Every structure is written in C-alpha cells, then in structure tokens.
Design a protein around this ligand. Structure first.
Ligand SMILES: Cc1cc2nc3c(=O)[nH]c(=O)nc-3n(C[C@H](O)[C@H](O)[C@H](O)COP(=O)(O)OP(=O)(O)OC[C@H]3O[C@@H](n4cnc5c(N)ncnc54)[C@H](O)[C@@H]3O)c2cc1C
Ligand SMILES: Cc1cc2nc3c(=O)[nH]c(=O)nc-3n(C[C@H](O)[C@H](O)[C@H](O)COP(=O)(O)OP(=O)(O)OC[C@H]3O[C@@H](n4cnc5c(N)ncnc54)[C@H](O)[C@@H]3O)c2cc1C
Lengths: 476, 476, 476, 476
C-alpha cells in the first residue's frame, strides 16, 4: 500500500533490493534519517560527513527523475523517528537493507520489536555482501578463523546472487534540513576535497568502467606501487553503497573469460588478485559478525603519552620521507594507498609508541572511506592480533620499504618538493647520506628538512624492553 | 680547401650559415673549445654546464650521421687554441657565427687580428638574430632607446632573412674529454634535471611543433597564468642556439595567415603577442650592442648585508607563498615563468633589500637559460633602470599579484602541499587569515608553515627612508 | 554423473543455462549433431552453412580452454544419433535449450519419448527468449494477435530473467568431420564473405560494445537511413545464439538510466526504439508458437511464371536503382538493411508479380541471418497477411522511397558506380530524366545502364486486374 | 606606383614572388583574364574549368582578407585586355610568373613587346620550378636527354631557392562575370566532383600536412598499390599552383633528416623516392623548353578507326576488369593512380589500336590535373618515344599487372561490385576461369559481365603485323 524505503548506507538505485521490492505493489517514498548520537564513539568523522552531504543531494535528484522526493529527519533516536514518519504518511511497511557493524546489529534488532507494537511489517534485505555470513561454514558447520580458508569456500559455494535492474517508475501522492553535516569554519577547507573526488552513484559507475578498461590489466604487477594510479580508487564508493559489489564481481568475471580466451595470462592473473581484495571486504564483515576492548593483546603495553610527538606525526614533520609524504597526501586528499597506510601506522605504533587508540581516532576523522569493519581489520593486521598478520617483534627498514612501494622516488618528490634534487639511493633515508651529497642538493637537515625525531636504533631497543614487560605483566 | 667550423652557441645543423657555407667547397671538421676563464665573472653556472654537456653529445652523433667528428679542446685562451688546431690539421679557413654580449665582442675582435698574422681567412656569420643591430635606426640614423619604438621598425624593415637547408654530406679525411663540466659530488643531483628537460636540437624541433599545435592558440589570454603550461618552454633551446629564431618567425607567420582566413581573431591576436616576446630577445641584444657597473642608478642605496635572510630566500622559507613556491620550482626544475621571476626578484630587492648583485649571481647558477643579455634586461626592468620599466617607489600587494598569475591557487598547492586545504581567498597571504580558518586546515604559523620574515608595513616604510637617502647621497 | 550438452543454435558459453546446469554435478561433454534432412524444405542455405562452419570451430576451441572437446555426429535422424552417443559414453542425462520453429517443436516432442524408453533423464531450458510464449496473455488468458498489444504486456510482466555467468571449469574423462557444410566449387567464393563478417561468440560481444558506445545514441533518427552503419548488425549473431538476448536487454536498460539522468532525451528515446526491434524478434516466435500453406490469402492470385524476369531480379539488372543496389549488396555481403528488404521484395511481388515462394527461397539461400520465424513475419508484412502490415493495393513511388532511405543518393553511388555523376533528383528514377541531363553524365539507357524492365504504369494496372480476379476466384 | 599582379596559374599567396614584389612599393590590384581561345586545341577541358571556377572564388576572398579585390576580364586576346586594364586604372607596372608550355612561351614573348609600345615596365618571375631549365646543363654546357642524367645534376646544383612569406597588407584605392566556365546542362553533374575534391590553396596546405604525417613513411613500399590512398593526391593542386613546389621540397628534406637521426632507413628511403616524383614534374618542363606533330614515330601506323570501340572504352565495358575499374573511377572522381593511367592507355593503343590522339583528347576532358607538359611525357612513356620508356613490341599480361597493383583484388571489387564474389586468382582475367567457378559466383559472361571485346592473342598478332608495316612505310 504505502512503503518507506529507509536509506542508510546504500545510496544508489541500481541493484537496490529494498527499493526494487517496494516499487512492485504501491506507493513509495524514500527516507534518510540522520541520527549520529546512537553511534556513540563511532560518530562519523569530518571528511565522511562531507561525502554524505554531497551524495544525498546526488541521490535526491535521481529519485526525482524517477518521480519521488527524499524525506530527511534529524533525531537523537532513529527508532522514534521512523515511527513518527509512519504516523504522518500513513504507511504500512518499512523496507531497508542490512548492516553488519556491531552497533547497527543491536540497533536493528530493537527497531523490529519497536514496530510490531504498532503492527507494521518490517522487511530487511541484503545489499552489501556476496553471501551472508551465516552461509559460509567449515565441514563441521563452524565459522572460519583465517582469510584464505574463508575465501576458498566462497569461490565454491554452489550459488551466487544476481543484479536487479532499477525500477521504471516510483509513486508518491505527496522534512528537516539535516544539513547539519558540517561547521561553518571548516566549510571552505572541506570543499577543497572536490579537487580529487566526486561523490554520487553516477560517478561510481564511471570509475568502475575507467578501471576495468585501463589498469585492471596491470594490477598483478602494479598493486603495490604508490607511484601512479594503479588501484581502482573505489573504496569511498563501496563504503557508502553507491556501487554494488555484486555488480563488480559480475563485470570482473566477464573480463576474465575474454582474457583467458586470448591467452592473456597476466591480465587473467590480475583479475584473480583484484577479486581477492574484494574478498577482504567480505571477510571484515565476517569476523565482525562472528567475533564482535578491540586490541586486548596490547593492554599492558607501556605507551609513551607524548602529545607533541602526536602533533609532529599528523603534520608530517618526522624526518622520515615515506611517513611525511603519506601524512601530507592524507591531509590533502583524504585517501592513501594501502601500503602507505601500513607504513604510517606501523610508524605510530612501533617507533613513536603512541597509543593505537590515538591513531585510530585520527584515521576516523581524516579518511573518506572510514569504515568500522575495515578499520578494525587494518589495525589488527599491523599490531599482530590476526593469526596471518604482521609480526610485532619486527621493525621495517626505511630503505627496503622505500624500494618496494616507491622504487624511483617519485612519490616522495611529488609530496615533498624540497627533496626533488636528492638522488634515489638516499631519498628514503637522508640521515645516512654523506655530507657533500646533502649539500649538492639544497638540503640541510634541521633547517629546511627535519632531522629524524627518533633514531631507528633507539626505538628498536626501546620496543624490545617494552615488549618484554607486557609479557610478564600479563602472566601476573 | 680545409675549413674549421667553430661551434660556440649555435648547437644545431639546420639554418647554420657557417656550417652550410663551409660544406660547399671542400673538407670540413667541427670544433668546440671550452674556455671558461675568458668570461671572468660570467663563467657559466652549474645548471648551464649540465645542459652544454648533454647537447654537445647530441650534436656530435648528428654530425657523425652526416659523416664527420666533433673535436674538443680545453684552454685558458681560445685564440691560442684554434691556432694550434689549424697547425695540426693544416686548415686554411675558420668560419663561425656572431655573438653580441660585450665579453665576446672584444674577444672576437682580437681573434681576427690574431689570425691574419698566420694568413688565415676568417669569416663570421649571423645565426642568432632577425636583423643585425646596425640595420635598425631612427629617421636621423640613430639607435632607439625604447622597445616599442624599436619593434615597430623591425616589422617594417623592407627585407627579411631566410632559412638555409642543412648540408647533404660533410667530408673530413681524419681531442680532450673537456667533460670537466660537472663536479663528482654535484653529478647525481644534476642528473635529476632530466625529469623536466631534454637537451639537443632534435628536441627543440619537437617542442616548437608541440607549442604551435597546442597552446599558441590560447597565448593571448593565458601567457600570464602560471597554472598550466601556457608558454612555449623554448628559452634554453633558444639560448644555446638549438632552434633557429628565423625558423620560429617563419612558422608563426604562416599559422597567422591560416587563422586570419578562418576569422579566428583570438588565435591571430595570440600569434602577434608571441612574436612580441621574440622581439624582446632581439631588443636585449640591441641595447647590449649600443649601450654596453650595470645598475648604477642604485649605487648609494643602503643595502642590508644579512646573509641568513639570503639563506631563507633561496630555501623558500620566507612565509610568502608565491615567493616560496617560485623558489622551490626554480631549485627543482631550473626554470620559472616570467611573471614569477618578477615576483621573486622584486621581493629580494624591495622587501629584504639585499644587494641585487647577490640575487643575479644566484639566478646565474640555477637557471638553465641564464643568458647574459636577457638577465641584464630583466634585472633592469624590475629596478627601474629602463624608461618603460617598473617603478621603484611601489611595492606589490601579495593578494593582488596572487589573483593575477594564480587565480585558483593551484600553483601554490602544487609546490607547497602543506597549504592544500587552505581556501583561495587566504592562500597568498596566510598571516591575514582569522585564527579558526587557519586551524580548520592543518596550519599553525611558525611550526609547519613559516611566519612572514619581514612584515609588509615594515619594509614599505624602510624603503621610503632608504629611497630618500640615495636621492641626497647622489646630489653630493 | 555424465551429461550431454546438445548444442543446436546456442553457440556460446555465457548465459547458457543448459551448459551451466550440467557443470554443477559431474562430467560434461558437448555434442553438435548435423542432421539437415529432418528440416525438409528448410534445409539450411549456402551462406548459413558457411557461418555454422566458422563458429563451430570458434566454439570448439573455447570449450577446450575450459577443458573439454566438442563431439560431432552426422545422421539423417538425430534422435537415433544422440541415443547412439549415450551408449558409447555411458551418459545418464541430456540437457539442451528450447527452439520454437514448428519443425523443431514436433522433433523435440518425439526425442523426449524416444529416451525414456532407455531411462535417460531429459531436461530442456530457455536460452533464446525474454519470456516464454505461454506466459504473455490477455485479460481473459488468451494470446494476442497484434504486436503493440503484445509488447505493452511484456514491458509490464511482474518478472524478468537473469544472466548466468559461465562455468569455471568443465570435466570429461575422454567424432565425424561433419565438415560437409560446403561444396568444393563454392568454397573460395564463400570465403569472400569474411571481408564483412566474422562469426563466433567473442565477436558478437565486440559488436554489442561497439554499437552501445557509438551509434545507439543516434538510432531514433538514423534507423531508416541505409547510408552509413546506423543499425547494430547483430542479426546473424542473434540467429545462431552467439549473443544472449537477455544480455542485450540488461545492457541497453542500463544505458537508458544514465541518459535519463543527463536529460539526454534523444539518446533515451533511441534506447526505447531499439528494444522495440528486439521485441519484434520475440513476437515472431510468439505467433509461430500460437498460430503455426503460409501465405494462403494469396492462393488464387495470377502469378507470372517468367524465369528470365527472375534472373534479371537476382542479377540486379532491372533498371530501378534502389532495387539493383540492394540486390548487389545482398550478393556481395549477405546482409541488407531492413528497409531495403522491404523494397526488393515488394518489387518482386507487386511489379514483376513472380510467385512469393520463388523469392523466399532465394532469401533463404543468400542471407546469413536466414531465420525461419523472422522470414515468415517479414514476408507476411509486405504481402498484407498481418493486420498491422502493409496494404496490398498500393505500389510505392521510387522517388519517394528513395528520398526516405537514401536522401543524398550515396547508397546508389556506392553499389552502382556507373551512376556516380547523376544528380540526386534523378538518381532513383533515371527514365524520367531529360535527355541532356543523362548525357551530361555518362549514361545512355540500354547500353551502360538498363531500361526499366516493366514500366510503373504497366504493372500498376496489371495488379488491379490481378487483384480483382482473386477476389472472385475466392468467393467461388 | 600602381602594379597589376596578373594571376594565370599561380592561385596562391604564399611563396608568390610576383605578388610579394608588388607589395613592397605602392598600390596593388590583382587580375585574372580568361582567354581560352589563344590556347587553340589546348582549350581547357570540362573538369579543369570546374576547378578554376572553385579556386578563383577561394583566392578572391583571401585577397579581400588582405585588403584588395580580384578583377576579371574576358577577351579573345589577352594582350589587348591587360593593356585596356592599364588605361582604366592608370597602372605603370605589370608583374606575373613564368609558364613553360610552348603556347604560353610565344604568347608571353609577344606581350612584352606589346607593352613597351606604351612604356609599361614588365617583370616576370619564377614561381613553378626549383631551377630554371637554362641552368641545368651537362659538362659541355648542353641540355640533357634522359631523366636520371638530369636529376643527378639538380641534386648537386650549388644553390637552391627560398620560400617567401606572404605580404602583410595590400593597398588598392578602388569586372566581368567570366563565370562562363560551365554549361547549364553539365552544371549539376560537375558539382558531384566535390565528393572527392576541394579546390583552393588552403586545402592544398592541409593535404600536404596530411601526407607528410600519415603515408609519406610507407611510400617506398606502397607507391605502386592502387588499393588504399598511398600517394599524396596533390597533382591538381600542383597544376594550378595552389601549393608551392619549393615549399614541398623544403618540408620533405626536413622530415628526411629526422628519420635519418632515428635510423628509420625505410622512412628515409621513402622521402628520397617521393622527391624523384617531383623531379619528373621538373623534367616535363625541361624537355618542353628544349625540345618543343607530337608522336611522330607513329605516323605510318595503321590505326583502326572504330568509334564504337571508343565508346566501349570510355564506358568501361571492355571485359577487362582492371581497365573497366580504372575507367569507372576516372569518370566518377576525375583522378587515377599513375599505374592505372599506364594500364588504360596501353590498352587503348596496343589492344584496340585506336589513334592516340583520340585518347589524349579524352584525358584532356576528364582529368582534373590535365597538364600540357605532363600529358606529353606520359603519352610518350607508353608509346616508346622516350629513350628510357616502355617498349612498343610488348603487351602486358592482365594477371601479372593485376597482381602488381591490385594484389588482393580490392580495387576491382570497389569499382565493379558485380565481381565481388569472384576469387582473386581469376578476378583480373574472368574468361580463363572454369565454368563452375564462374557460376559459383553470380557471373555469366555476356549477360551481367561483358565478354572481352578483343581476345589477347588476336591483338598480339594484329600488332606484330601492324608494327612491321610502319617499319617499311617509313623507309619509303
Ligand atoms: C591501518 C589500515 C586501516 C584501514 N582502514 C580502512 C578503512 O577505514 N576503510 C576501508 O575501506 N579500508 C581500510 N583499509 C584497507 C585499505 O587501506 C583500503 O581498502 C584500500 O586503500 C582501498 O583503496 P582502493 O579502492 O584503491 O583499493 P583496491 O585495490 O582497488 O581494492 C578494491 C576494493 O577492495 C576493498 N579492499 C581492498 N583492500 C582491502 C583491505 N585490505 N581490507 C578491506 N577491504 C579492502 C576496498 O573496498 C577497495 O575499494 C585499511 C588498511 C589498513 C592497513
Ligand atoms: C522480407 C523480410 C525478410 C526478413 N527476413 C529476415 C530473416 O530471415 N532473418 C532475420 O533475422 N530478420 C529478417 N527480417 C527482419 C530484418 O530485415 C532484420 O532483422 C534486420 O535487417 C536486422 O538487422 P540489424 O541487426 O542491423 O537490425 P537492428 O535494427 O540492429 O535490429 C536489432 C535486432 O532485432 C531483431 N529485429 C530487428 N528488426 C526486426 C524485424 N523487423 N523482425 C524481426 N526481428 C527484427 C534482429 O535480431 C536484429 O538483430 C526480414 C524482414 C523482411 C522485411
């Protein structure tokens, strides 16, 4: 009769099963409810609130071209807000799509019991995953604990889900500003993020075509290089649900059969490794559902509570050029390559030895794709929580990690133009360069480029004493 | 019979009248002589010696494909060096091309009398100019003193010179390394200039085609913008004589008649303004020939002899973002847009009030197109020596000169990535921004960006007291 | 356990429901059986047998890259041939896809009862249609009789079918040449069809991308012009089942939502008219299933049994330049634009008044997309059998049908280069041109271009006497 | 003071020495005089008069954009016409450019003596040649008699001429229609030549750029193939003087030094063979100047005066497909490839044995580049007049000349679409094909393709009897 489609993090119209199912019977009107106080400490950060504002306006005009209007409501309790929207419009059903983070699971469990008190039929759908996490089990019917044990089952699952076409027409018979999504001082500096990004589902479709046709071919040899645009740059579109992940899986498995029929064995190997990256997004929702504070294996660790070392880390003034170039790209554009996120966060935890909660809260505020389940899997991968993760006893050599991800030094020279005439054999560790090499370029360490804020042999021996105390503070 | 073609600053084979005339009679062999001690204080700088080294090797292989070999000689006196090359090879003639800087004029005057002592016929040719400076006169037969009085005569001169084809074959019947053109410490930092530049006459021809076909059309509206490659980037090719200037004048006047026949009035107006820039190169040789220390109208000026202000100027750490971005581009690439060269040199002379000799010697060492006659006309244009030049009583507003040459702030954000989230209305003067605007971006002045090293009202009143003393020290 | 996939007219691997269902359980091996004697008079023609030969070899190597081999069998009775293939390989199931022409419907009905005598499970699938013809009914549950009554129901059908991905791997545990598909005299003239066409499912995918990205935009204004490639040229791929028709419907309805979101109202109108052409392919299978000699409303028509008029028609020597250019393109390439097929077949039936069986048998032998159900709907559309078809009392003016489909005369000048200097106002009717116009070009009618073989006023009055006799021979 | 620039066959403004010299002193006005009755039998043909009409209108508007107007005069005596134009405008000088055909040499000799009777200074210039024909001599100072003896001297001539820039402005202080250049019946068939050609000097410049950048590279391997556009298509621009031939020589010798510096030895060899074709245009003016009826070595030849064989030759209905395709391209477009002009004219002279005057008059009427001196050299090359020409005792095999210039048969299939399904081993000689091959395509010889009008063994023995009679009729 009358159905509310409640948009939360599915801001698209293609392959939207809650919008497609409501457009079969009767009258539809779409609703977004901004209720950030139920998230608690996972209130959306500053750069994420800019992206929601831009793509809700993109979604509102596209629903108007199908013939409707998007209704906005601001409350401190969203379960009292859709119920007040039902009493106004006289609606009988509420349809929405699932979410899997642990805050929204107990929130969606309560809104179902809140609305059979008023006799409203509530239907929820799957719009985010390939399979649901209660479908992938082991031989005994128990959940997995490693990724490649989990991903070899999803590729042999005896089924696969489909892509729904969008509806042909919507019908209403007809709101708050909610534009509180930004402060007025931070407003012109937020608008400079549009030099690199453009939100909306119509732009997510153009970036999937641009990746499939240009650099998906070279992905198996280039996905670790930070020079050049070698990855898809799809992660803020995939976080807000502007591109369907089953739409990506279908199109990549169709390019793979054409390249196997040309015997292009490298382009075919690239299509296999790109789908493994999509399976890491599937796995982050999997262990969040099954094993829902966070990093408890580091709770007797002696952390250095130094706030000016934290200020030098986010300013990009540490004296380590891969860390400084990554922190300047993060502030300028709101995105980092995956291998640079490992570099700047291993530096914060192992070298400066600041608390990991401090760095997680800075990533939550400055990344455009700040995802609750993917930030958990990333910070557990660098701290050694995951079984098949990184080791904690190890510190990375700056010259070796420089040669892997930035072999010609062109990532450092783009973001630190003061080091543009420094040769590549010393550009990732300028404190080791001899004195006449440094002044053959225009570099004096301490005046126009910084000295290293901690020496590498200082923190390597400061960690082994700090590792060996939390081993005996845990046994007591 | 046997003819030496002495290459000095004409490193090409197309439109080379000394090479073309020698290839008519008999045996030819080419000679370069590196003799930098006759230049005195105009010894070629560090970046210029890198370009000569790369393009002599480019010229040597192209003369081999015509069938010869380039002979190199190093001496502290070049007039004793070609005479020793004549006695070895048994040559009868020496042909070369003219130069017009005041050191080479008295040096070429002496080598003619040095070689009729041995009975050697010496012929010199015009390879650098459209007309010779003893051909453009006024109505009474006297030289001009302004540029547009001079350039309206050259466009109505009753003649024009032609483009010689290269010879079809050369004939010898057959050297020092001279590779002393770089220090071994400065060698790997010099090689990083190849990220932006490629010397040689074959590359000068590809950059003339690339400019004529892409952005010569938009030159009349874009030649003052430093964002984007809006100019030709031909000046280090035109300084070393790898592209002929009569070849440029012919090809641009042929595009102008095609655009006038399509009634493309803006593309035709752009071709008129680009040839006016070539006439400024002609005019710099004109007043050097007629009026050959240099800036004597500022000789009782009180200069501040502060050497750490000079170190902060060439490091790009002054706190003025147009000056800092221009000084970082100059060190990284060896080239600046013409409007930025006015900005960074007016700042050194009017704000810091350092001696102009100090800044001229730094431009001589860091520019790839460091030309003796063009650096004279440029530094006389900013100091008020020229009649139709800049005023000396004026200081430029940083916001207004920012909006003219960098209207969207994309030149500052490329070279100073720390200011990438600062809005455009304050990016050229961050000390005027309110305090919540600066911390809405990641900018604290004094820690990750510098404070202005002198305030603008300090130096404006320091100049008016310094101007008014050299007015009375000159009358005494 | 072991399953035969019987390929008949579904020569692809993407969206193949019989191949996809067999690849779930066990061992698969593919089989084609050439049995042309069960078709009777619908034995495949000469150009169709060339295309089957080229695309079976294309399908055989693509099944090898998935790990199998295609087995070929030649029999005069295909129901005795798959049963002999089961006894060899020890297979338990046979899966295939439906067909809807009236010969294959009674043949598939008998092979099901032939194989439960041996206890073999037989499954058939839908691979050719959007919906099955027993699903589209009227309000009373009866089949339609007009096209636009039928197509307005298919666009409102409460369901739609999906696109299956191809299998990841096939398994056999392992044949006749059947290459009898061409005679040895006709073999080198058949191979010249490759100048215009390339069979195989991998080429059907490249022609769908090429049409969606280039000229689908302009289809609503260009689909009646025979100058230029304005249509998709997909019909021999769609006849042999090398491209899926649900794959076309999905991709065209996705381009339609992007163009509606740019307010490109003409590109959106073109996507609506292209899907109406696909619905004509759906409708031809619909009335073949419900109303399964053929043109019985012309059975007392007095036909002229003149065999040299039939020889002049297929040679393209009639003196009517649209008919002659269409007959020369048909012999050279094996394809005609849809508006030219109306022209050359209305000419054979209304002007020459030859029997329509004679022209249908020539189209069956010379077209690459000679489809049984689509040739029926086409020849019923020109003869007036269909209710919403052409009128039979009318003859078309050659100048008016020339201006509609060939407005600048460039289709005639391509295929009849003798008329290249004839102006456009007379190029479609040269017998009406004045005598000095014809000899201002190089045209003398009767020597280098033919006179019209029948005059237009002769056959217009010969038809009205021939129409009015079959009206009274039918009432008796 | 006042100067007439008399345009005859130099319809351009770039590199025009008579227009450039007049634009130095005073007032200029341009004049074309149409006087076709002084040419006698070399009255310009039908297709040439269409091109003059189109490019005089192109030249008139381009002189208006320089500020003048083109004056037209029609007379039966041009020497009385410019003298009447002098008396009207009060002009003092007449400047024009040389021509070298033997009619214009004695006409220009008389107009000089006609105008010193009135005291008018007459100056003539070189605008058509690289060198003048009184500058290329042998060792004794005598003219050459072979081409490669002549062209090895022009490449070693101790000089070369230059390219003048166009004037910047013209000055008048200010006519008949002459549009009689076409009949009103032939007017709409002449306008269809614009499908392939576009006259004017601005289009001659775009076709020189298009050839230098696309297919000059492949010229040494493709200049004998008639499939594809492998030559420059510059000959009607070079005949009417819309492109300068010194402009072509300069630009091709500049591409040759760039390709020699990349060691592109095939692109460099192509630039050498293209300039040899330009030297054939130079040589045709050379022997016309020195050895000024025409083919007197065939004057006792027994010619067959059959006028219906002449009608079948120009209709393209001989039964020889290379001759028929060349005659249909010539009538449609007005141009033929150089190897096809040898084929269709050797066929007219050796097979049909029609008088060569009959075929020369048909080429004069149907070619757009019908040049008096180049048609002489071409018809002397096929008849054996030239020493290094063709032999007269030989007749060419149609299969061998077919494989040289049309190896895949795609030139025949374009112009004779009736033979599109005939395989390549018989497409150049269909009378030798076996009977089942011809009817496997749609070819019956005598009905839809013609039988050969003379058999090849008939005319081979008819020529040897006709050769051997003019040997004894000449000795008497
Ligand atoms: C410390 C740390 C924190 C991270 N925080 C986040 C976060 O907040 N949000 C987030 O989306 N990703 C996070 N990641 C994962 C990774 O950095 C990004 O997903 C990656 O940069 C996406 O960029 P892309 O689209 O170009 O990658 P692509 O190579 O194009 O990857 C394709 C898609 O797969 C997914 N994906 C790829 N790699 C991973 C991965 N390792 N884990 C999960 N999903 C993946 C993303 O949706 C991505 O768009 C984090 C990683 C680390 C080490
Ligand atoms: C006398 C006559 C005989 C015909 N015989 C045949 C035949 O044997 N086989 C055949 O496939 N078509 C036949 N047609 C239909 C039509 O001529 C062709 O389908 C059309 O030329 C396909 O070319 P295309 O792919 O470029 O067209 P498009 O415009 O690209 O059409 C898209 C697709 O829709 C289908 N289609 C389009 N128009 C029609 C139509 N009128 N009827 C049925 N399907 C259509 C085809 O599969 C075609 O590939 C006949 C028409 C006439 C008038």
């Amino acid at each position: 009769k009358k159905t509310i489609v409640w948009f939360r993090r599915d801001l698209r119209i293609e392959d939207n099963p809650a919008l497609a199912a409501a457009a079969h019977e009767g009258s539809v009107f779409p609703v977004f409810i901004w209720c950030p106080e139920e998230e608690g400490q996972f209130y959306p950060g500053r750069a994420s609130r800019w992206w929601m504002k831009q793509s809700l306006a993109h979604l509102s005009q596209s629903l108007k071209a199908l013939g409707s209007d998007l209704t906005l409501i601001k409350t401190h309790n969203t379960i009292s807000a859709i119920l007040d929207c039902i009493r106004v419009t006289g609606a009988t059903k509420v349809v929405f799509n699932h979410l899997y983070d642990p805050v929204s699971l107990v929130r969606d469990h309560t809104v179902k019991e809140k609305l059979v008190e008023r006799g409203i039929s509530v239907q929820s759908y799957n719009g985010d995953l390939l399979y649901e996490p209660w479908e992938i089990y082991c031989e005994k019917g128990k959940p997995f604990t490693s990724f490649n044990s989990y991903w070899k089952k999803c590729l042999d699952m005896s089924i696969e889900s489909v892509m729904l076409p969008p509806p042909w027409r919507l019908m209403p018979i007809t709101s708050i500003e909610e534009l509180g999504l930004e402060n007025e001082a931070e407003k012109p500096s937020n608008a400079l993020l549009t030099r690199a990004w453009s939100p909306g589902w119509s732009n997510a479709d153009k970036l999937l075509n641009e990746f499939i046709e240009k650099q998906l071919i070279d992905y198996a040899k280039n996905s670790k290089k930070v020079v050049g645009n070698s990855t898809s740059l799809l992660s803020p579109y995939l976080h807000f649900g502007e591109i369907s992940v089953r739409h990506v899986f279908q199109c990549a498995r169709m390019k793979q059969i054409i390249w196997a029929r040309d015997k292009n064995s490298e382009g075919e190997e690239s299509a296999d490794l790109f789908l493994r990256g999509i399976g890491l997004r599937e796995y982050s929702r999997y262990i969040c559902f099954n094993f829902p504070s966070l990093l408890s294996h580091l709770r007797f660790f002696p952390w250095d509570a130094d706030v000016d070392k934290f200020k030098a880390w986010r300013q990009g003034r540490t004296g380590y050029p891969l860390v400084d170039a990554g922190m300047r790209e993060l502030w300028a554009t709101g995105w980092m390559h995956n291998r640079i996120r490992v570099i700047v966060s291993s530096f914060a935890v192992k070298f400066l030895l600041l608390p990991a909660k401090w760095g997680m809260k800075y990533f939550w505020d400055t990344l455009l794709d700040a995802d609750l389940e993917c930030d958990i899997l990333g910070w557990q991968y660098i701290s050694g929580s995951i079984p098949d993760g990184h080791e904690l006893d190890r510190l990375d050599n700056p010259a070796l990690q420089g040669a892997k991800y930035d072999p010609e030094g062109e990532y450092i020279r783009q973001w630190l133009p003061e080091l543009a005439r420094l040769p590549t054999e010393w550009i990732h560790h300028p404190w080791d360069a001899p004195l006449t090499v440094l002044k053959a370029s225009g570099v004096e360490l301490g005046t126009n480029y910084a000295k290293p804020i901690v020496d590498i042999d200082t923190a390597r021996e400061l960690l082994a004493k700090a590792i060996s105390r939390t081993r005996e503070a845990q046994i007591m």
